[PDB]
């Protein structure tokens, strides 16, 4: 089998990134943000804290003829960014753009902090990295993919995410016309939970590669690029202005400016990130500050390639015995 489907940005930034997800018998379409770095499908739901809805869409399992409770089953997930939720568990049917898991574990929402409620075009996550951070207890839950794996024409799924524009998530299948060039595979270390590479090096403009190792992840789920300190800096001195500042939360550049692309490097291959994906506009309505796409990770702990860097890609998420990641331009 494969599936196959649209993703979309939220609002003109390309924030993050949602995907519609029928849930349930009857279908009840959730559009969900598919997210890299978590291994949790939950969902905004007729159990969330009323106060705590503000404009997306719920599932409801009572009118699923096929949702079951897990009985006993919990979940509660902090992420990266500070945002956290919580609830129960059901078990019912999922299809991605055709490709249909019955049994999935969907995790109902309870409780969601700040940020979620705020977000009225996110109705809930759908996890893709290794279900080994998935958080149901007593008894942890696999994610859509490992559950669709083994009916999938090939253990993969691929992430071409839009620039401004919508993109594809697709299951089961490489689209060889989705990408121009090869493919270049890339080892990964699951220990950690998350799909993490060795990057080659980088270089800002047209400036010379510097061949370094940058240990990071693949996610989805993180709207920015975060690397070392150094490459940041780096990049930013070539912007004229550009600064970080401690009360915005990291650099910050002039509007005015025209930003400088930044390579990274996967094996001998080099993928560009245009200058205008890396800027994030105004910090606020009407500033002629504007937010930088590519921020320090200094106290993050991890490299993170977010949507900023994936975006210029078209990305392989190997999930074979052993998994691999692949980058191709396009």
Request: one cysteine or more; charged letters at 10%; a negative charge.
């Amino acid at each position: 089998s494969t599936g196959s489907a649209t993703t979309t940005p939220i609002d003109s930034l390309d924030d993050a990134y949602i995907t519609p997800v029928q849930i349930g018998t009857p279908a009840q379409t959730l559009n969900l943000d598919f997210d890299t770095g978590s291994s949790d499908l939950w969902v905004f739901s007729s159990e969330t804290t009323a106060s705590e809805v503000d404009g997306q869409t719920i599932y409801t399992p009572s009118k699923s003829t096929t949702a079951k409770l897990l009985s006993g089953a919990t979940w509660s997930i902090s992420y990266g960014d500070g945002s956290s939720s919580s609830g129960d568990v059901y078990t019912d049917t999922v299809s991605v753009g055709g490709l249909t898991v019955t049994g999935q574990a969907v995790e109902s929402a309870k409780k969601v902090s700040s940020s979620f409620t705020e977000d009225s075009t996110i109705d809930g996550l759908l996890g893709l990295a290794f279900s080994t951070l998935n958080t149901v207890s007593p008894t942890q839950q696999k994610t859509f993919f490992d559950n669709a794996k083994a009916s999938l024409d090939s253990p993969v799924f691929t992430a071409d995410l839009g620039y401004h524009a919508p993109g594809t998530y697709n299951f089961g299948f490489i689209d060889t016309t989705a990408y121009t060039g090869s493919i270049t595979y890339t080892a990964v270390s699951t220990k950690q939970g998350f799909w993490e590479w060795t990057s080659t090096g980088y270089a800002v403009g047209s400036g010379t590669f510097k061949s370094t190792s940058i240990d990071g992840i693949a996610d989805t789920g993180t709207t920015l690029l975060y690397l070392p300190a150094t490459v940041v800096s780096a990049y930013w001195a070539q912007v004229s202005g550009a600064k970080s500042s401690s009360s915005v939360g990291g650099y910050v550049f002039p509007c005015s400016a025209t930003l400088p692309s930044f390579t990274f490097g996967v094996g001998s291959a080099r993928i560009v990130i245009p200058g205008d994906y890396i800027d994030f506009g105004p910090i606020s309505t009407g500033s002629s500050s504007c937010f930088g796409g590519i921020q320090s990770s200094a106290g993050i702990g991890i490299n993170i390639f977010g949507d900023v860097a994936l975006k210029a890609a078209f990305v392989v998420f190997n999930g074979a015995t052993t998994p691999t990641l692949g980058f191709a331009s396009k």
